[PDB]
Design a protein around this ligand. Structure first.
Ligand SMILES: [Ca+2]
Ligand SMILES: [Cl-]
Length: 369
């Protein structure tokens, strides 16, 4: 069954059958960040230069008050590094432009992040926007953040923009102090639980000795030394109603089910990322979402950026056309015998699984999306 190892981001096209697709050279991509990206831009230069790629056109955008705090968060740089290098690698080494929509760190509440989302939608220049972040949806709901941000994502979807959002790293235990085992008590992350975004969960990725895809299982690496679970977020929103396209998954509640799709997330099978100059092997659903973003941006470039928000089409296409995905069947996203189990077809840990990009491209050529 393949081998578990780290991977250069430039390998993700081979792994997910995207090498025959155009690059994302004709599609602009956004990344939501918390604070600045000055070190991240140096790490991105290290990435493209080491891989012999053309340099990436970047812009940074202060999305809130002009007097806000956009200084670099040092630990955050590794996350913006994961996002940006994984997007560019998955995109085949080229994007039209990479836009960093930086959230103010000195704003009240969650308003810095809300303003970053808002700016990406108002500007309506990026076709695909990565969000490798989140938190307990019940906490977001309790202070009004959920409602305010969902309005923004609704505008995005109506405008034809794709927000991609990591499902979470806490398995079913998102709301229990961010991942502490809690028995049968299951919860999900915001903004992944929005029906106006594509929620991306996580796999453990096995490759053959030649580097081809072998298999994927659920991402679940168990507990760390603090006792926190590291596993793919998945479940259903307690607040958001089920969008009609999800009705194809029978026997589920009348709620937004997540994730929609999944890609590599296990640290043990994760991406090799330049962070403050040093190569580190990094996972999370923060990896899986940028993989999706880069791959989806290729399909946008192949289709003149004319593909709208793709949730309905994913559910109709994949339910009727199982060859479009790698269906994850093994593993669970809890602990101690609790959590959801993968299975045939759509499941709570992984949604439909990972996309086979060339097969999806051929489907889109025939059928539209
Ligand atoms: Ca499955
Ligand atoms: Cl909807």
């Amino acid at each position: 069954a393949g081998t578990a190892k780290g991977h250069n981001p430039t390998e993700f096209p081979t792994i997910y059958d995207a090498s025959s697709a155009p690059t994302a050279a004709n599609t602009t991509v956004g990344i939501i960040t918390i604070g600045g990206v000055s070190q991240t831009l140096q790490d991105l230069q290290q990435f493209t230069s080491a891989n012999g790629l053309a340099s990436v056109n970047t812009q940074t955008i202060q999305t809130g008050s002009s007097n806000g705090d956009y200084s670099d968060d040092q630990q955050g740089q590794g996350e913006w590094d994961l996002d940006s290098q994984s997007i560019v690698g998955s995109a085949g080494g080229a994007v039209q432009q990479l836009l960093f929509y930086m959230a103010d760190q000195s704003a009240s509440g969650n308003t810095g992040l809300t303003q970053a989302f808002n700016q990406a939608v108002s500007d309506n220049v990026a076709k695909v926007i990565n969000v490798s972040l989140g938190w307990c949806e019940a906490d977001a709901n309790a202070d009004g953040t959920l409602q305010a941000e969902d309005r923004i994502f609704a505008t995005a979807a109506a405008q034809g923009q794709t927000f991609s959002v990591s499902s979470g790293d806490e398995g079913v235990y998102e709301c229990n102090n961010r991942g502490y085992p809690d028995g049968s008590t299951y919860s999900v992350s915001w903004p992944a639980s929005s029906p106006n975004v594509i929620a991306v969960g996580g796999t453990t990725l096995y490759t053959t000795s030649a580097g081809a895809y072998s298999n994927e299982t659920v991402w679940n690496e168990g507990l760390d030394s603090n006792g926190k679970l590291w596993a793919t977020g998945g479940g259903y929103s307690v607040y958001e109603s089920k969008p009609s396209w999800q009705s194809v998954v029978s026997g589920t509640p009348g709620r937004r089910l997540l994730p929609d799709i999944s890609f590599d997330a296990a640290q043990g099978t994760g991406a090799l990322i330049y962070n403050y100059g040093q190569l580190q092997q990094i996972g999370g659903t923060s990896l899986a979402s940028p993989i999706f973003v880069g791959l989806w941006a290729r399909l946008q470039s192949a289709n003149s950026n004319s593909l709208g928000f793709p949730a309905a089409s994913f559910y109709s296409a994949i339910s009727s056309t199982p060859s479009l995905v790698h269906d994850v069947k093994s593993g669970n996203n809890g602990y101690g015998g609790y959590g959801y189990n993968a299975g045939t077809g759509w499941d709570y840990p992984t949604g439909w699984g990972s996309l086979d990009i060339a097969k999806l491209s051929a489907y889109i050529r025939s059928n539209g999306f």
